[PDB]
Amino acid sequence: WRCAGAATVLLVIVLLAGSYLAVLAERGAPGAQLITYPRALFWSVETATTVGYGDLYPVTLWGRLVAVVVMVAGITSFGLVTAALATWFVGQCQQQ
Amino acid sequence: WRCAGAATVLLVIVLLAGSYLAVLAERGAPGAQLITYPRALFWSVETATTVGYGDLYPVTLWGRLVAVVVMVAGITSFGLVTAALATWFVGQCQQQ
Amino acid sequence: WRCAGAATVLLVIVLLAGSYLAVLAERGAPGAQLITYPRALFWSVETATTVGYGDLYPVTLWGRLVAVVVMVAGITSFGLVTAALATWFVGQCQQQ
Amino acid sequence: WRCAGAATVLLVIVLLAGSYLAVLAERGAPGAQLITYPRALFWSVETATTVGYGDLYPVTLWGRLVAVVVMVAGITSFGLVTAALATWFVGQCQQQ
Ligand SMILES: CCCCCCCCCCCCCC(=O)O[C@@H](CO)COC(=O)CCCCCCCC
Ligand SMILES: CCCCCCCCCCCCCC(=O)O[C@@H](CO)COC(=O)CCCCCCCC
Ligand SMILES: CCCCCCCCCCCCCC(=O)O[C@@H](CO)COC(=O)CCCCCCCC
Ligand SMILES: CCCCCCCCCCCCCC(=O)O[C@@H](CO)COC(=O)CCCCCCCC
Ligand SMILES: CCCCCCCCCO
Ligand SMILES: CCCCCCCCCO
Ligand SMILES: CCCCCCCCCO
Ligand SMILES: CCCCCCCCCO
Ligand SMILES: [K+]
Ligand SMILES: [K+]
Ligand SMILES: [K+]
Ligand SMILES: [K+]
Ligand SMILES: [K+]
Ligand SMILES: [K+]
């Protein structure tokens, strides 16, 4: 019925697994700033929402490969979460 | 009928409340640049539209949590505002 | 019929008028880098497509107001241009 | 049937051809950082997904023209790849 929660679960899984694997892939490259889990979790949100401020980004092969998975899986899931919120909002747009 | 104004109202509420709570959450962290309301209002627009230049961004736990609300609520509402503008434009695309 | 060209015309108008008014609004503020028309035209593309690298952005009240018009009018028109390209691509996706 | 692979092929072609032509267009301008193929390939992903961190961007006329092609062709194709992933996910959203 409300599979929007299932897409929300998949989004949180991508945000958590992405931030965990990013720190795992970035530690080892001199100059890398995506090397601590707390700020790496907000980087996953920056990538999945496509906002991308640029304060945090990968600079390694794997780290950028992890970002690709966060892009493909996160933007799709976040697009499904924000689409359900759009449908619900219209459902009251006529109950004026 | 034209609930596009209702989504526009929700967008302005998210832009204003987001910029107000961001300054409230960022003041206190040394090095924070999102600490004045006027430029924080344009940061809300940068986030809601997903453009994200990167000249302004939060660096605190709460400030980033405020950004998440601006992302979830702002991108959904701005997506509804820009979708209604798209529909209206097509309505004249055949009145050539 | 192919109103996609009409949305393409509106996009070019927003890109040109936006880059012209941005330079007009940014010149006068010390430190502004969006002050020449050639690179301001690519800034309009960065904003309308929502990519937003961050190498160029407004720092004035009007300049940021011009960016809002480029966001509202440009993302809507570019969304219509890229949607027609998507429909056309599917039209051959079954002429295998 | 599953033309999603065809849009995926077009995306990879735009990512590869875009990163190849970007290095070809950027080498020659002092200060250009998009001058090696490996990191230019991730720049194509940053542009096509619209994330745009800002660590890499063109600064030449042609290089920015190449970016426009990566924007028009890449965002359209990546939008088709992520839309098929969204449809497939809903197909199991009711096989609970
Ligand atoms: C014409 C061909 C265009 C593309 C060629 C790409 C070749 C890949 C070879 C990888 C070697 C690593 C180079 C190196 O030692 O540098 C690493 C450390 O700086 C950075 O790694 C990287 O550059 C990351 C690779 C790009 C990410 C891939 C995006 C996936 C869609
Ligand atoms: C494997 C687990 C991966 C994720 C773990 C996250 C743990 C959160 C603990 C918070 C402690 C704060 C750390 C600190 O003192 O630093 C703050 C000041 O720099 C920055 O705050 C932050 O890092 C903000 C947290 C991330 C934003 C959350 C995004 C919501 C979707
Ligand atoms: C609680 C209220 C939150 C929002 C309050 C906003 C008040 C606006 C007053 C403008 C005074 C200019 C300040 C200044 O001298 O500085 C300018 C030069 O740095 C920068 O201009 C600016 O900050 C631009 C304003 C923000 C852009 C508006 C985005 C439209 C959606
Ligand atoms: C009112 C008119 C507004 C727009 C005018 C644009 C005129 C173009 C003339 C090009 C001359 C190059 C200037 C130069 O020597 O500088 C190059 C090296 O820095 C940078 O090239 C550039 O500025 C790139 C041009 C902008 C990209 C085009 C985006 C396409 C949608
Ligand atoms: C360099 C350490 C490799 C860690 C990569 C984790 C798995 C990445 C999958 O994209
Ligand atoms: C550190 C001050 C906390 C201010 C947070 C305001 C409410 C945030 C809701 O996301
Ligand atoms: C400071 C000079 C003002 C120029 C503004 C041009 C019109 C902007 C419309 O948003
Ligand atoms: C300055 C070298 C020109 C290279 C341009 C390659 C083709 C670009 C097509 O947009
Ligand atoms: K920077
Ligand atoms: K974006
Ligand atoms: K988008
Ligand atoms: K930046
Ligand atoms: K962006
Ligand atoms: K950026």
Coordinates of C-alpha atoms and ligand atoms in Angstrom, one line a residue:
Chain A
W1 CA 0.0 0.0 0.0
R2 CA 2.4 2.7 1.3
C3 CA 5.5 1.3 -0.3
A4 CA 7.0 4.8 0.2
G5 CA 8.4 3.5 3.4
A6 CA 10.2 0.7 1.5
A7 CA 11.9 3.3 -0.7
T8 CA 12.7 5.3 2.5
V9 CA 14.3 2.2 4.0
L10 CA 16.3 1.6 0.8
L11 CA 17.4 5.3 0.9
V12 CA 18.6 5.0 4.5
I13 CA 20.5 1.8 3.7
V14 CA 22.3 3.5 0.8
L15 CA 23.1 6.6 3.0
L16 CA 24.5 4.4 5.7
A17 CA 26.3 1.8 3.6
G18 CA 27.6 4.6 1.3
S19 CA 29.1 6.7 4.2
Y20 CA 30.6 3.5 5.7
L21 CA 32.3 2.4 2.5
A22 CA 33.4 5.9 1.6
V23 CA 35.4 6.3 4.8
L24 CA 36.8 2.8 4.2
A25 CA 37.8 3.8 0.7
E26 CA 39.1 7.3 1.4
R27 CA 41.4 6.6 4.3
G28 CA 44.8 6.0 2.8
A29 CA 44.9 8.8 0.3
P30 CA 46.8 11.9 1.5
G31 CA 44.6 15.0 1.5
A32 CA 41.3 13.1 1.7
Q33 CA 38.7 14.8 3.8
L34 CA 35.9 12.1 3.6
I35 CA 37.5 10.0 6.3
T36 CA 35.1 10.3 9.3
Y37 CA 31.7 8.6 9.5
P38 CA 29.6 11.5 10.9
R39 CA 30.4 14.0 8.1
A40 CA 30.4 11.2 5.6
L41 CA 26.8 10.6 6.3
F42 CA 25.9 14.1 5.4
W43 CA 28.0 13.7 2.2
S44 CA 25.7 10.8 1.3
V45 CA 22.7 13.1 1.6
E46 CA 24.4 15.7 -0.5
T47 CA 25.0 13.2 -3.2
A48 CA 21.6 11.4 -3.1
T49 CA 19.6 14.6 -3.2
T50 CA 22.0 15.9 -6.0
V51 CA 22.6 19.1 -4.1
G52 CA 26.4 18.6 -3.9
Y53 CA 27.8 21.6 -2.1
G54 CA 31.4 20.4 -2.7
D55 CA 32.7 20.6 0.9
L56 CA 33.1 16.8 0.8
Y57 CA 33.9 14.5 -2.2
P58 CA 35.9 11.4 -2.9
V59 CA 39.4 11.5 -4.5
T60 CA 40.1 7.8 -4.8
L61 CA 39.1 5.2 -7.4
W62 CA 37.0 3.1 -5.0
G63 CA 35.7 6.1 -3.2
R64 CA 34.4 7.5 -6.5
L65 CA 33.0 4.1 -7.4
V66 CA 31.2 4.1 -4.1
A67 CA 29.8 7.6 -5.0
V68 CA 28.5 6.1 -8.3
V69 CA 26.5 3.5 -6.3
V70 CA 25.2 6.3 -4.0
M71 CA 24.2 8.2 -7.1
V72 CA 22.5 5.4 -9.0
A73 CA 20.7 3.9 -5.9
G74 CA 20.3 7.1 -3.9
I75 CA 18.9 9.4 -6.5
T76 CA 16.5 6.8 -7.6
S77 CA 15.2 6.0 -4.1
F78 CA 15.2 9.7 -3.0
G79 CA 13.2 10.4 -6.3
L80 CA 10.7 7.9 -5.1
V81 CA 10.5 9.3 -1.6
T82 CA 9.9 12.9 -2.9
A83 CA 7.4 11.7 -5.6
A84 CA 5.2 10.1 -2.9
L85 CA 5.4 13.3 -0.9
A86 CA 4.3 15.2 -4.0
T87 CA 1.3 12.9 -4.6
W88 CA 0.2 13.1 -1.0
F89 CA 0.3 17.0 -1.1
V90 CA -1.9 17.1 -4.1
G91 CA -4.4 14.8 -2.3
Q92 CA -5.2 17.7 0.0
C93 CA -4.8 20.4 -2.7
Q94 CA -8.5 19.9 -3.5
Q95 CA -9.9 19.4 0.1
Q96 CA -9.8 23.2 0.4
Chain B
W1 CA -8.1 24.5 -8.6
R2 CA -4.8 26.2 -8.8
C3 CA -3.2 24.5 -5.8
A4 CA 0.2 25.6 -7.3
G5 CA -0.1 28.6 -5.1
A6 CA -0.4 26.3 -2.1
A7 CA 2.8 24.5 -3.0
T8 CA 4.4 27.9 -3.5
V9 CA 3.3 29.0 0.0
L10 CA 4.8 25.8 1.4
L11 CA 8.1 26.5 -0.5
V12 CA 8.3 30.0 1.0
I13 CA 7.6 28.7 4.4
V14 CA 10.4 26.1 4.1
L15 CA 12.8 28.8 2.7
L16 CA 12.1 31.2 5.5
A17 CA 11.9 28.7 8.4
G18 CA 15.0 26.9 7.0
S19 CA 17.1 30.0 6.8
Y20 CA 16.0 31.1 10.3
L21 CA 16.8 27.7 11.9
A22 CA 20.1 27.4 10.0
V23 CA 21.5 30.7 11.5
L24 CA 20.1 29.5 14.9
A25 CA 22.0 26.2 14.5
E26 CA 25.2 27.5 12.9
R27 CA 26.1 30.4 15.3
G28 CA 28.3 28.8 17.9
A29 CA 30.6 26.8 15.6
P30 CA 33.9 28.5 14.8
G31 CA 34.4 28.9 11.1
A32 CA 30.7 28.8 10.3
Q33 CA 29.6 31.1 7.4
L34 CA 25.9 30.5 7.5
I35 CA 25.3 32.8 10.4
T36 CA 23.4 35.7 8.9
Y37 CA 19.8 35.6 7.8
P38 CA 20.0 37.5 4.4
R39 CA 22.6 35.2 2.8
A40 CA 21.0 32.2 4.6
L41 CA 17.8 32.8 2.7
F42 CA 19.7 32.4 -0.6
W43 CA 21.3 29.2 0.8
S44 CA 17.8 27.8 1.3
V45 CA 17.1 28.5 -2.4
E46 CA 20.4 26.8 -3.4
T47 CA 19.4 23.7 -1.5
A48 CA 15.7 23.5 -2.4
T49 CA 16.4 23.9 -6.2
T50 CA 19.3 21.4 -5.8
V51 CA 21.8 23.8 -7.5
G52 CA 24.1 23.9 -4.5
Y53 CA 26.9 26.3 -5.5
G54 CA 28.8 25.5 -2.3
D55 CA 29.5 29.1 -1.1
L56 CA 27.3 28.4 1.9
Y57 CA 26.6 25.1 3.7
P58 CA 26.1 23.9 7.3
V59 CA 28.9 22.4 9.4
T60 CA 27.0 21.5 12.5
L61 CA 24.8 18.5 13.5
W62 CA 21.6 20.5 13.8
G63 CA 22.5 22.8 10.9
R64 CA 22.9 19.7 8.7
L65 CA 19.7 18.3 10.1
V66 CA 17.9 21.6 9.2
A67 CA 19.4 21.1 5.7
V68 CA 17.8 17.7 5.5
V69 CA 14.4 19.1 6.2
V70 CA 15.0 21.8 3.6
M71 CA 16.0 19.1 1.1
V72 CA 13.0 16.8 1.8
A73 CA 10.4 19.5 2.0
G74 CA 11.9 22.1 -0.3
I75 CA 12.8 19.9 -3.3
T76 CA 9.3 18.3 -3.1
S77 CA 7.6 21.7 -3.1
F78 CA 9.8 23.3 -5.7
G79 CA 9.3 20.2 -7.8
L80 CA 5.5 20.8 -7.6
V81 CA 6.0 24.5 -8.4
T82 CA 8.1 23.8 -11.5
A83 CA 5.8 21.0 -12.6
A84 CA 2.8 23.3 -12.7
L85 CA 4.8 25.9 -14.7
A86 CA 5.7 23.1 -17.1
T87 CA 2.0 22.1 -17.6
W88 CA 0.9 25.7 -18.1
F89 CA 3.6 26.2 -20.8
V90 CA 2.4 23.2 -22.8
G91 CA -1.1 24.5 -22.6
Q92 CA 0.0 27.3 -25.0
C93 CA 2.4 25.1 -27.0
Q94 CA -0.5 24.2 -29.2
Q95 CA -2.3 27.6 -29.4
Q96 CA 0.2 28.5 -32.1
Chain C
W1 CA 3.4 19.8 -32.9
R2 CA 7.1 20.0 -31.8
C3 CA 6.7 22.7 -29.2
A4 CA 10.0 21.4 -27.8
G5 CA 11.6 24.1 -29.9
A6 CA 9.5 26.7 -28.1
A7 CA 10.8 25.5 -24.8
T8 CA 14.3 25.6 -26.3
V9 CA 13.8 29.2 -27.3
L10 CA 12.6 30.1 -23.8
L11 CA 15.6 28.4 -22.4
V12 CA 18.0 30.4 -24.6
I13 CA 16.2 33.6 -23.7
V14 CA 16.6 32.8 -20.0
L15 CA 20.2 31.9 -20.4
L16 CA 21.0 35.1 -22.3
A17 CA 18.9 37.5 -20.3
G18 CA 20.1 35.9 -17.1
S19 CA 23.8 36.3 -17.9
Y20 CA 23.2 39.8 -19.1
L21 CA 21.4 40.9 -15.9
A22 CA 23.8 39.0 -13.7
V23 CA 26.8 41.0 -14.9
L24 CA 24.7 44.1 -14.6
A25 CA 23.9 43.3 -11.0
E26 CA 27.3 42.0 -9.9
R27 CA 29.5 44.8 -11.2
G28 CA 29.8 47.1 -8.2
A29 CA 30.4 44.6 -5.4
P30 CA 34.1 44.1 -4.5
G31 CA 35.1 40.5 -4.9
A32 CA 32.4 39.6 -7.4
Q33 CA 33.6 37.2 -10.1
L34 CA 30.4 37.1 -12.2
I35 CA 31.2 40.3 -14.0
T36 CA 32.0 39.3 -17.6
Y37 CA 29.4 38.1 -20.1
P38 CA 31.2 35.1 -21.6
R39 CA 31.7 33.2 -18.4
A40 CA 28.3 34.5 -17.1
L41 CA 26.6 32.6 -19.9
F42 CA 28.1 29.3 -18.7
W43 CA 27.0 30.2 -15.2
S44 CA 23.4 30.4 -16.5
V45 CA 23.8 26.9 -17.9
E46 CA 25.2 25.7 -14.5
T47 CA 22.1 27.1 -12.8
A48 CA 19.4 26.1 -15.2
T49 CA 20.7 22.5 -15.4
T50 CA 21.0 22.5 -11.6
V51 CA 24.7 21.2 -11.8
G52 CA 26.1 24.2 -10.0
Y53 CA 29.9 23.6 -9.9
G54 CA 30.4 26.6 -7.7
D55 CA 33.1 28.4 -9.7
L56 CA 30.7 31.2 -10.3
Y57 CA 27.8 32.5 -8.2
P58 CA 26.2 35.9 -7.3
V59 CA 27.0 37.7 -4.1
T60 CA 24.6 40.7 -4.4
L61 CA 20.9 41.1 -3.6
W62 CA 19.8 41.7 -7.2
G63 CA 22.3 39.2 -8.6
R64 CA 20.8 36.5 -6.4
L65 CA 17.4 37.7 -7.4
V66 CA 18.4 37.2 -11.0
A67 CA 19.6 33.7 -10.1
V68 CA 16.1 33.0 -8.7
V69 CA 14.5 33.9 -12.0
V70 CA 17.1 31.7 -13.8
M71 CA 16.2 28.9 -11.4
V72 CA 12.4 29.1 -11.7
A73 CA 12.3 29.8 -15.5
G74 CA 15.4 27.9 -16.5
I75 CA 15.0 24.6 -14.6
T76 CA 11.4 24.5 -15.8
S77 CA 12.3 25.1 -19.5
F78 CA 15.4 22.8 -19.4
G79 CA 13.1 20.1 -17.7
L80 CA 10.8 20.4 -20.8
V81 CA 13.7 20.2 -23.2
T82 CA 15.2 17.1 -21.6
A83 CA 11.7 15.5 -21.2
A84 CA 11.1 15.7 -25.0
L85 CA 14.5 14.2 -25.6
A86 CA 13.5 11.4 -23.3
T87 CA 10.2 10.7 -25.1
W88 CA 11.9 10.7 -28.5
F89 CA 14.6 8.3 -27.4
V90 CA 11.9 5.8 -26.2
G91 CA 10.2 6.1 -29.6
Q92 CA 13.1 4.2 -31.1
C93 CA 13.6 2.0 -28.1
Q94 CA 11.1 -0.5 -29.7
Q95 CA 12.1 -0.1 -33.4
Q96 CA 14.9 -2.6 -32.6
Chain D
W1 CA 11.5 -4.7 -24.2
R2 CA 14.2 -3.6 -21.7
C3 CA 15.4 -0.5 -23.6
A4 CA 16.8 0.6 -20.3
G5 CA 20.1 -1.0 -21.4
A6 CA 20.0 1.1 -24.6
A7 CA 19.8 4.3 -22.5
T8 CA 22.5 2.9 -20.3
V9 CA 24.7 2.4 -23.3
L10 CA 24.1 5.9 -24.5
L11 CA 25.0 7.2 -21.0
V12 CA 28.3 5.3 -21.0
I13 CA 29.1 6.7 -24.5
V14 CA 28.4 10.2 -23.3
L15 CA 30.5 9.7 -20.1
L16 CA 33.4 8.3 -22.1
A17 CA 33.3 10.7 -25.1
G18 CA 32.7 13.6 -22.8
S19 CA 35.7 12.9 -20.6
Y20 CA 37.9 12.3 -23.7
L21 CA 36.9 15.6 -25.4
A22 CA 37.1 17.5 -22.1
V23 CA 40.8 16.7 -21.6
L24 CA 41.3 17.4 -25.3
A25 CA 39.7 20.8 -24.9
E26 CA 41.2 21.8 -21.4
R27 CA 44.9 21.0 -22.1
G28 CA 46.3 24.3 -23.3
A29 CA 44.7 26.6 -20.7
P30 CA 47.0 27.5 -17.8
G31 CA 45.3 26.6 -14.5
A32 CA 43.1 23.9 -16.0
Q33 CA 42.6 20.9 -13.7
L34 CA 40.4 18.7 -16.1
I35 CA 43.4 17.5 -18.0
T36 CA 43.7 13.8 -17.2
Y37 CA 41.3 11.1 -18.4
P38 CA 40.8 9.1 -15.1
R39 CA 39.5 12.1 -13.1
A40 CA 37.7 13.5 -16.1
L41 CA 35.6 10.4 -16.3
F42 CA 34.3 11.1 -12.7
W43 CA 33.7 14.7 -13.8
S44 CA 31.3 13.4 -16.5
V45 CA 29.4 11.5 -13.8
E46 CA 29.3 14.6 -11.6
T47 CA 27.8 16.5 -14.5
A48 CA 25.4 13.9 -15.9
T49 CA 23.9 13.1 -12.5
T50 CA 23.7 17.0 -11.8
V51 CA 25.5 16.5 -8.4
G52 CA 28.4 18.8 -9.4
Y53 CA 30.7 18.9 -6.4
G54 CA 32.9 21.5 -8.0
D55 CA 36.3 19.9 -7.6
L56 CA 36.5 19.7 -11.5
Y57 CA 35.0 21.9 -14.1
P58 CA 36.0 23.3 -17.5
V59 CA 37.4 26.8 -18.0
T60 CA 37.7 27.0 -21.8
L61 CA 35.1 27.8 -24.5
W62 CA 35.2 24.3 -26.0
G63 CA 35.5 22.6 -22.7
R64 CA 32.4 24.3 -21.5
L65 CA 30.7 23.5 -24.8
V66 CA 31.6 19.8 -24.2
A67 CA 30.0 20.2 -20.8
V68 CA 26.8 21.4 -22.4
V69 CA 26.7 18.3 -24.6
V70 CA 27.3 16.2 -21.4
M71 CA 24.5 18.0 -19.7
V72 CA 21.9 17.8 -22.5
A73 CA 22.7 14.2 -23.5
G74 CA 23.8 12.8 -20.1
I75 CA 21.1 14.2 -17.8
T76 CA 18.5 12.9 -20.3
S77 CA 20.0 9.5 -20.5
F78 CA 20.7 9.2 -16.8
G79 CA 17.1 10.4 -16.2
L80 CA 15.9 7.4 -18.3
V81 CA 18.2 5.0 -16.4
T82 CA 17.0 6.2 -13.0
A83 CA 13.3 6.2 -14.1
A84 CA 13.5 2.5 -15.2
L85 CA 15.0 1.7 -11.8
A86 CA 12.1 3.5 -10.2
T87 CA 9.5 1.6 -12.1
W88 CA 11.1 -1.8 -11.4
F89 CA 11.3 -1.0 -7.7
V90 CA 7.5 -0.3 -7.6
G91 CA 6.9 -3.6 -9.4
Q92 CA 7.9 -5.4 -6.1
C93 CA 6.4 -2.7 -3.8
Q94 CA 3.2 -4.7 -3.9
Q95 CA 4.6 -8.3 -3.9
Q96 CA 4.9 -7.9 -0.2
Ligands
LIG1 C1 39.7 7.6 -22.7 C2 39.4 6.9 -21.4 C3 38.7 7.8 -20.4 C4 38.5 7.2 -19.0 C5 39.7 6.3 -18.6 C6 39.6 5.9 -17.1 C7 40.6 4.9 -16.8 C8 40.5 4.3 -15.3 C9 41.8 3.9 -14.8 C10 41.9 4.0 -13.3 C11 43.3 4.3 -12.8 C12 43.3 5.2 -11.6 C13 44.2 6.5 -11.8 C14 45.0 6.9 -10.6 O1 45.9 6.2 -10.3 O2 44.6 8.1 -9.9 C15 43.7 7.9 -8.8 C16 44.3 8.7 -7.6 O3 44.3 10.1 -7.9 C17 42.4 8.6 -9.2 O4 41.5 7.5 -9.6 C18 40.4 7.9 -10.5 O5 40.7 8.6 -11.3 C19 39.0 7.3 -10.4 C20 38.6 6.8 -11.8 C21 37.4 7.4 -12.3 C22 36.1 6.9 -11.6 C23 35.3 6.1 -12.5 C24 33.9 6.6 -12.7 C25 33.1 5.4 -13.0 C26 31.9 5.8 -13.9
LIG2 C1 28.7 3.8 10.5 C2 27.8 5.0 10.9 C3 27.8 6.1 9.9 C4 27.1 7.3 10.4 C5 27.4 7.7 11.8 C6 26.8 9.0 12.2 C7 26.8 9.2 13.7 C8 26.2 10.6 14.2 C9 26.8 11.0 15.5 C10 26.8 12.5 15.6 C11 28.0 13.1 16.4 C12 28.4 14.4 15.9 C13 29.9 14.4 15.5 C14 30.6 15.7 15.9 O1 30.9 15.9 17.1 O2 31.1 16.6 14.8 C15 30.2 17.6 14.5 C16 31.0 18.9 14.4 O3 32.0 18.9 13.4 C17 29.7 17.4 13.1 O4 28.4 16.7 13.2 C18 28.0 15.9 12.1 O5 28.8 15.2 11.6 C19 26.6 15.8 11.6 C20 26.1 14.4 11.5 C21 25.6 14.0 10.1 C22 24.3 14.6 9.7 C23 23.3 13.5 9.7 C24 22.6 13.4 8.3 C25 21.2 12.9 8.6 C26 20.7 12.1 7.4
LIG3 C1 14.2 35.8 9.3 C2 14.3 36.4 7.9 C3 15.2 35.6 7.0 C4 15.4 36.2 5.7 C5 15.7 37.7 5.8 C6 16.1 38.3 4.4 C7 16.1 39.9 4.5 C8 16.5 40.5 3.1 C9 17.1 41.9 3.4 C10 18.1 42.2 2.2 C11 19.2 43.1 2.8 C12 20.5 42.9 2.0 C13 21.6 42.5 3.0 C14 22.9 43.1 2.6 O1 23.2 44.3 2.8 O2 24.0 42.2 2.2 C15 24.1 42.0 0.8 C16 25.6 42.1 0.4 O3 26.4 41.1 1.0 C17 23.7 40.5 0.5 O4 22.4 40.5 0.1 C18 21.6 39.3 0.3 O5 21.8 38.7 1.3 C19 20.6 38.8 -0.7 C20 19.3 38.5 0.0 C21 18.8 37.0 -0.2 C22 18.3 36.7 -1.5 C23 16.9 36.5 -1.5 C24 16.5 35.2 -2.0 C25 15.1 35.3 -2.6 C26 14.3 34.0 -2.5
LIG4 C1 25.2 39.6 -23.9 C2 25.9 38.3 -24.4 C3 26.0 37.3 -23.3 C4 26.8 36.1 -23.7 C5 28.0 36.4 -24.6 C6 28.9 35.2 -24.9 C7 29.9 35.5 -26.0 C8 30.8 34.3 -26.4 C9 32.1 34.7 -26.9 C10 33.2 33.7 -26.6 C11 34.5 34.4 -26.4 C12 35.4 33.6 -25.4 C13 35.9 34.6 -24.3 C14 37.3 34.3 -23.9 O1 38.2 34.6 -24.6 O2 37.5 33.7 -22.5 C15 37.6 32.3 -22.5 C16 38.9 31.9 -21.6 O3 38.7 32.4 -20.3 C17 36.4 31.7 -21.7 O4 35.5 31.3 -22.7 C18 34.1 31.3 -22.3 O5 33.7 32.2 -21.7 C19 33.1 30.2 -22.7 C20 31.8 30.9 -23.3 C21 30.6 30.5 -22.6 C22 30.2 29.1 -22.9 C23 28.9 29.1 -23.7 C24 27.8 28.3 -23.1 C25 26.9 27.8 -24.2 C26 25.5 27.7 -23.8
LIG5 C1 40.3 0.7 -1.2 C2 39.4 0.0 -0.2 C3 38.2 -0.6 -1.1 C4 36.9 -0.4 -0.3 C5 35.8 -0.5 -1.4 C6 34.5 -1.0 -0.7 C7 33.5 -1.5 -1.7 C8 33.3 -0.5 -2.8 C9 32.1 -0.9 -3.7 O1 31.9 0.1 -4.7
LIG6 C1 22.0 24.0 18.2 C2 20.7 24.8 18.2 C3 19.6 23.8 17.7 C4 18.6 24.6 16.8 C5 17.9 23.5 16.0 C6 16.5 24.1 15.5 C7 15.6 23.0 15.1 C8 16.2 22.1 14.1 C9 15.2 21.1 13.5 O1 15.8 20.3 12.5
LIG7 C1 21.9 46.6 -9.0 C2 21.5 46.7 -10.5 C3 20.1 46.1 -10.6 C4 20.0 45.2 -11.9 C5 18.9 44.3 -11.7 C6 18.4 43.9 -13.1 C7 16.9 43.3 -13.0 C8 16.9 42.2 -12.0 C9 15.6 41.4 -12.0 O1 15.6 40.3 -11.2
LIG8 C1 40.3 23.3 -28.4 C2 40.2 21.9 -28.9 C3 38.8 21.7 -29.4 C4 38.3 20.3 -29.0 C5 36.8 20.2 -29.1 C6 36.3 18.8 -29.3 C7 34.9 18.8 -29.8 C8 34.0 19.6 -28.9 C9 32.5 19.4 -29.3 O1 31.7 20.1 -28.4
K9 K 36.1 26.0 -3.1
K10 K 20.9 18.9 -9.0
K11 K 16.7 16.9 -10.6
K12 K 33.2 24.6 -4.3
K13 K 24.4 20.5 -7.7
K14 K 29.4 22.9 -5.7

